[PDB]
Amino acid sequence: MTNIRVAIVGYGNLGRSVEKLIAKQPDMDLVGIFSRRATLDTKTPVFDVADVDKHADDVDVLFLCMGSATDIPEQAPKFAQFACTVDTYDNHRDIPRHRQVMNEAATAAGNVALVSTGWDPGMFSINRVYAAAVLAEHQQHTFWGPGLSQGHSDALRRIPGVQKAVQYTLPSEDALEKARRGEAGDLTGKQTHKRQCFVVADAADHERIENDIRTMPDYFVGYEVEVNFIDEATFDSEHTGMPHGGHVITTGDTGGFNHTVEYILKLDRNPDFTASSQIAFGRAAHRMKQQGQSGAFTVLEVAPYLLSPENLDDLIARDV
Amino acid sequence: MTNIRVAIVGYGNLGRSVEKLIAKQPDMDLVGIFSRRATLDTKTPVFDVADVDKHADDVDVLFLCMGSATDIPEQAPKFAQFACTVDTYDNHRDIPRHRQVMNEAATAAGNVALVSTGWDPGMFSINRVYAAAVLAEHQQHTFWGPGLSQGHSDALRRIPGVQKAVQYTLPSEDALEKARRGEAGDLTGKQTHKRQCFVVADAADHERIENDIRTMPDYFVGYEVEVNFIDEATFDSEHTGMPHGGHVITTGDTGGFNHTVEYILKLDRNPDFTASSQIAFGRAAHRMKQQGQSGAFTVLEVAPYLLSPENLDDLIARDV
Ligand SMILES: NC(=O)C1=CN([C@@H]2O[C@H](COP(=O)(O)OP(=O)(O)OC[C@H]3O[C@@H](n4cnc5c(N)ncnc54)[C@H](OP(=O)(O)O)[C@@H]3O)[C@@H](O)[C@H]2O)C=CC1
Numbered sequence A, B: 001m002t003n004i005r006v007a008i009v010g011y012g013n014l015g016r017s018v019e020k021l022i023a024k025q026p027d028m029d030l031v032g033i034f035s036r037r038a039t040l041d042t043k044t045p046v047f048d049v050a051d052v053d054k055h056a057d058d059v060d061v062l063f064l065c066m067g068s069a070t071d072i073p074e075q076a077p078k079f080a081q082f083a084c085t086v087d088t089y090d091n092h093r094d095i096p097r098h099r100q101v102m103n104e105a106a107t108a109a110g111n112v113a114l115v116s117t118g119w120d121p122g123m124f125s126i127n128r129v130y131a132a133a134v135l136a137e138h139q140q141h142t143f144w145g146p147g148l149s150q151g152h153s154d155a156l157r158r159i160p161g162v163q164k165a166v167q168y169t170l171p172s173e174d175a176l177e178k179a180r181r182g183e184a185g186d187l188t189g190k191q192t193h194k195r196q197c198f199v200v201a202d203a204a205d206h207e208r209i210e211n212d213i214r215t216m217p218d219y220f221v222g223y224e225v226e227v228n229f230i231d232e233a234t235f236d237s238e239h240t241g242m243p244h245g246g247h248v249i250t251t252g253d254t255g256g257f258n259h260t261v262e263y264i265l266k267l268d269r270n271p272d273f274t275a276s277s278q279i280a281f282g283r284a285a286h287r288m289k290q291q292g293q294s295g296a297f298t299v300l301e302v303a304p305y306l307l308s309p310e311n312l313d314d315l316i317a318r319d320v
């Protein structure tokens, strides 16, 4: 009855999303939260992150939901000392090193570390690899969105006189249809997406701002940008969500015959879906260590059935 | 090391596609073809299927491209004795059994057999699994076509007195939409697809071919079926292409938020894509064997990176 004993390290949006979804898992028990703050908006027990050493045996897997930017790279390796570990670290350029270092740690403690799960990296990585592997010579693209970009939203905000603001990254529909036909080979980043800004600001300032936006080097110049100055009420009512999604499109030619494989995600709420993967890869981590494996692995190294709470035979009988 | 030695068994549409596509691979050498027929139009060496026996020592893996309806079930298991094998076996209700017997033959000879690969079963099965696992509470549907079903076409053709035949599968566009809006629940493939038959045969035989068709165990029973007896000309001109494809749709709700996972295939030539998938799993099979495994496995049981001609470090560096 496994009830694989889990805990959460870090209590932000993600951390909250994991907490809430564990109730819908048949086989997991939440043993509590490890936090750097004493007092959280919650009934699950809270512990001091420094005291993780002491709880070592109440826990099977630790979901690491702290920051990618600086926390993960430094804190994560020590945690693999105490249990299996799953993270959603999204810095592509650092993955190889993160894994290498996560690898020396987990191996020495005999734990299993799953790194860089989520939707991208995660689901979209898997799909990229599958479709590219299949379609020998192939053309591949990843579009993001439609969804929230915190980095672009932050740039907007630093603008003088902007009160509240958000920017969405949308895929250029033209650009999708073209990739679908194997014709998007010579297209730049400025052509593949479009940006849609929603700004709350005094009417006196609209012209300067809109100008400040469309000329913003590196963040905004070069794109199709659409700008809306909205009431604070419509802002709060409609632009307080965290949606996102994307497309992985791969094409290949087999001698005069085209094939297109498209993977699409539509998420009403980013950290909820990200929690969903992370949780599924947590179950896989536990099963992997149960089979005597150890070290760090990416989502590319785990057989699919491992994420499932159903028994293999049942999966083979119904879904194959 | 290094170049995998490979052979085809069954030289029909699939077998020809696999022939064509092996050229596109960097790490495979096609050693020959094993056929029940003496004269094949190809420059590849051909062999008597009764002679596999003698080539066991110089092939690392055998692609089984005989008919699922009748050939696979008794023939396959005997191939497992001589090398790794890879099939695209399609009778869902008979897969677990197939796997058992293939496992036994494989495990005995120390080989690896990969069963039921292709797109459905194959890629569609994998997608079904990742999505239902990730999203705890979900609704999931699959839709095939409009396109030409290879298994269904080969089935019709094994009915005595059928000179020529082809079958098209037609999905219900309405169902497809309700699905996208999480509203088609409690609907099945059998109620969402129509089966269309184009047949060439003497009018005298019409009565009994129609009976055999509509009473064809789970290849045809339970579906709405249409039988069209047409002139050879009309058939030879109007029914020549082999397109197909479909959609796997899954919808789920986290605490009051929705997510949709969509997987799509648009294939210009059915055998060509199927062949490309069968090939990548062939690479996986050979690797698992060197890696020390043996026995029969489903597509749910192989880590994605095993299908790729690239090194894992590169895959991780570039695609994750
Ligand atoms: N791979 C993927 O597809 C995806 C990956 N991610 C990754 O998820 C990571 C975490 O995201 P997210 O949860 O949204 O980030 P947050 O900023 O919400 O929280 C991160 C950390 O901040 C601390 N913290 C949170 N709230 C407060 C607060 N009010 N005051 C003080 N400290 C606080 C928490 O640590 P403590 O509890 O110790 O205070 C927490 O672990 C990101 O770095 C991201 O890259 C996200 C989506 C997708």
Ligand SMILES: NC(=O)C1=CN([C@@H]2O[C@H](COP(=O)(O)OP(=O)(O)OC[C@H]3O[C@@H](n4cnc5c(N)ncnc54)[C@H](OP(=O)(O)O)[C@@H]3O)[C@@H](O)[C@H]2O)C=CC1
Residues within 6 Å of the ligand: B009, B010, B011, B012, B013, B014, B015, B034, B035, B036, B037, B065, B066, B067, B068, B069, B088, B089, B090, B116, B117, B118, B119, B120, B121, B122, B150, B151, B154, B270, B271, B274
């Ligand atoms: N899992 C998946 O997604 C997919 C699986 N499939 C499977 O692939 C299978 C093969 O389909 P396909 O290649 O279209 O079928 P064919 O009718 O072309 O061939 C089947 C066998 O018939 C024999 N054959 C071929 N041509 C002739 C001929 N002219 N006269 C007499 N015998 C001949 C060949 O054996 P021999 O050389 O020994 O005579 C061949 O192996 C199907 O059963 C289908 O299930 C197809 C698509 C997808």
